[PDB]
Design a protein around this nucleic acid. Structure first.
Lengths: 260, 66, 61, 67, 67, 62, 68, 262, 67, 66, 67, 62, 67
RNA sequence: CGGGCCCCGAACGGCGGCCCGACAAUAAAAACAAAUGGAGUAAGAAUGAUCAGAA
């Protein structure tokens, strides 16, 4: 087995009050990649967030409310690294990576880009910087699993009424083109769309009860994995959890097992 | 003989340098431009000078009509 | 092999081709050869013979 | 040469309902109308031309005896 | 050329050894080879489905047979 | 072709080789015999495979 | 083989012994350098030799720009 | 023997044509169908017996403004059906398209905007040609063979106009429109009767208002019998009488071997 | 009689609005509605052709019109 | 009922106007109408078949009739 | 009796002006919001006033699940 | 009638996913919400009401 | 009435495998379990209600004699 | 030992001569965390003025 959980909690505190800690504790998994901690590493040090039988790793942004990402693993990773050299990355700890034998996973959290124009500019900046870094991450032997919420949909199949969202951030032409270039040209794939080419599957919908009723979801979570692991995809699922997190948990299993 | 229709189409795409998107049998989309071709090979110029074997090319979709 | 596809092309029958990867292609037959089939649908979406699995015309011929 | 052609000719003459499965595993159905060295015509509601290089196996719905 | 697969398959057929042909798609095909020729082998399944070589990948006999 | 030197060298030295198929499943075992169409692995079951669905043959030891 | 554009490419990849990244159809990647080639096989020298088949190679992406 | 003739003259205002007596030459010349282009008047004006050709069925459709445009036709025999419009505003709102469905041929009148007045006219021309190539690509697969008889206001090749140097910027030889025409002709398989039967130069249809240009024969070939390839084989001959100009264009007359019938 | 159907047809007739009748198959019918009666509608055009009510699928007036 | 259908059909019969009936399936029929009833209709063509009104879509005469 | 279900459902769909994507038996996809209807004709409002007959409609697909 | 009502009621009392085929050959599978002499609602992405006269075959999943 | 009821009763009691054709031309197969004055329930592996409005021709594979 | 090179038979085989198997040398890469699941997954063109298809 080889499970991976992705829950952009948008605040580990709200996650705790919503019962995310108990759900993850009950949810038997190998690695858990929650995003947007909205708290300092010292806050994550609170044993309440420490899941029984899992390690604690977290990198906080310069400003807690800005972001922050954490990573829980069942076995001691070979090494944990944070940052990518970019200001938009280092100054906010939006990237944290653990190292295991043969495969090393990472936790990515892109800026929403929907708050303001400056957020969209930062999004474009981080996108170009990240595709550059990944170009530098081509011939690298170690296979990767960039588990992160990219705040962008690849195809219309990933979001309904695209006609209305075409101009709204998250589905704009340049972001979709960047994602397509990152996926196809560079040989990267996705476990879900590979194992299950089924529409209507989303992760992030408005907290508004109306959108939840009519299910206005935007697929923002993606299990970006190097082509080496593409062959070892078991199955993907997007549970419709009752408002536990804006980004619904993204659980995927893999045929390839892990090792220290 | 074998490429009476493939050869002229590929040669026109090359001369016109139309940005094409090659879809592999594996389903991986490959955007870029056709640099050169032959019997069973096509050179795609992009960020990385790529060589895609014809036997593994499913479809090619030029972005503009030719 | 040749006569069937030639009739499909000349008669302008709406053809839908399922590739070996399963992709359901749609379009009309523009021109074909030993190892190539030009599919006319907005753009000249060329399709190779080795990757074609089934050719589904909309009506018999 | 010695086995494929007689088997397919018998399937055609007897018009046995055969079930063909593609290399990918997709299950097809229909009768063998005409054979070819590179292709086959499977008439099932709408005649579909299937390529031989994409045929995994040919499952006849009824047992057949070679000549 | 083609001097090795012929005797191997002929011996597998003569002794009627249960072979498990694993297709390229990862599907099992337990049965006995009834015959074989170019671009074709004939299984001894309840229906005796005719398989194509291009699709076949491996031919493992359940019991190790001698050459 | 360089395929036959490689294969017969592995056969003479009987090096445990790991063969990857087109699907990707990892096979293991020595090579007993081979021709242009098939390979006869020396595995516990000696699973025979045709040459039209091979990916890469690599020896576990240099 | 009539035009043989693959032959000059493989020859320049081998003569300079450039690090190649031969992708396969299954999805795995094979790092190394082309030692030699023929019609259906290519030799990758990564500690040990790899008998990667031609018909299984999806794309060949050299990590080193090769002028030609 | 079996023969049919079609005549097309862009009168550019039925009033001017009637002033010079076009009705006399029209009723005199034996023809099966007439495609009078650019009426620039109300349909009731065409309905008037003075403009209505005796013994010919008439149907006229104009734009929201009578003087803006409009097209009419005179069929010798009652057509099976008559349709107008194309769904595009550029053609429906301005009556730039009229078709009298008959058997197979279904005579269709087309009028592309000149694009020489202002930039808005050129934008309308671009939109119209784009929508038209879209519709025709969606239509080529149809069984019924059409004959889009209309003045396009575009020269296809140098054979259609002399002194192309100064004409590069003048409408009628602009690059986008020429490319669109070459596309719809070759890439889609459409042909023209005149170019097919006669590869002769010097013959033109459109002339400037300058009398010196007419004396020197500085004219343009803006008319094309855009026909489905189905009918390209039965083209016999065409002629362009150089009678004193009735309007900007000349009467395009063509003869076919196929005999129409209700 | 009807609540809106017959009034709708009467309104379409009074102003002779050019109406394009679409057939269930898919073909279109141009020409104004000359007259109408249960199970039949008369169309005014080059010929006094009569269309059948049970066959009409959609009636779209060329101009937005209200009862 | 049939306030307009019956007069029209009776006039077409009396004036023996050759009418062309187009079925919903698309096939083409030709021949004048000899007689008719509330359902079927007798034709004038060489075969003189019985067409069904539920399958008829349009009736276009060769000459407009009052 | 015969309109105990479709009548109130369609009335609610109309009042809620929910964008509908009506499908014809021929397979064409029309869109808009129903503004009125009775028993044999349904009036759809959009860019161009459209009158659709009930006997030719296959499904009425609203954009939101109405209660 | 005598046969349609009880069977169509049991097809919902047991929660049997019903698949209906349109005359054009289009297939839709969903749970029936309510049925009438001329209308039958099929639970799908949205409440897609279906006309009885347009249904060709009713093949339940079980 | 005089012909439909005896025919259906015979086809039911005799359990003749019929090949119900659809208005679109598709040839279905299966046994009839019970018929109604407006719909018929034909079972093929599982029960499948078939509407009479969508049936073109019912051809019994075996000759039948009316009572 | 086995790869690259030329030499020779009749697009197709192969044999001798050899060389190398550590690049007579990248004006420089903001950085290589370290070199068999398997008896088989295919929901609807906003509408050809009108499609008969054979030993």
């Amino acid at each position: 087995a080889m499970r991976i959980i992705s829950v952009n909690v948008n605040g580990i505190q709200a996650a705790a009050e919503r019962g995310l800690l108990s759900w993850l504790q009950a949810q038997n998994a190998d690695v858990i990649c929650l995003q947007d901690t909205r708290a300092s590493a010292f806050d994550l040090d609170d044993p309440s967030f420490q899941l029984d039988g899992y390690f604690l790793y977290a990198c906080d942004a310069e400003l807690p409310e800005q972001g922050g990402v954490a990573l829980y693993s069942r076995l001691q990773p070979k090494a944990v690294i944070s940052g990518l050299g970019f200001e938009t990355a280092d100054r906010y700890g939006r990237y944290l990576q653990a190292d295991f034998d043969k495969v090393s996973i990472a936790t990515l959290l892109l800026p929403s880009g929907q708050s303001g124009d400056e957020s969209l500019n930062q999004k474009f900046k981080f996108m170009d910087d990240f595709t550059h870094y990944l170009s530098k991450q081509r011939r690298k032997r170690r296979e990767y699993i960039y588990c992160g919420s990219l705040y962008v949909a690849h195809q219309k199949m990933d979001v309904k009424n695209w006609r209305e969202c075409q101009q709204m951030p998250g589905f704009l032409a340049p972001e979709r083109a960047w994602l397509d270039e990152v996926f196809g040209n560079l040989g990267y794939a996705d476990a879900l769309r590979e194992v299950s080419r089924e529409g209507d599957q989303f992760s992030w919908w408005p907290d508004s009860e109306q959108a939840e009723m009519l299910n206005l979801g935007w697929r923002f979570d993606y299990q970006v994995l190097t082509p080496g692991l593409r062959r070892f995809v078991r199955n993907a699922k997007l549970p419709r959890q009752p408002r536990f997190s804006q980004h619904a948990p993204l659980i995927v299993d893999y045929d390839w097992q892990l090792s220290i | 003989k074998g490429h009476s229709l493939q050869d002229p189409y590929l040669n026109t795409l090359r001369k016109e340098r139309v940005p094409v998107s090659i879809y592999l049998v594996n389903g991986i989309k490959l955007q870029g431009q056709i640099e050169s071709f032959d019997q069973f090979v096509i050179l795609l110029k992009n960020t990385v000078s790529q060589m895609v074997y014809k036997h593994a090319i499913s479809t090619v979709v030029p972005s503009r009509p030719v």
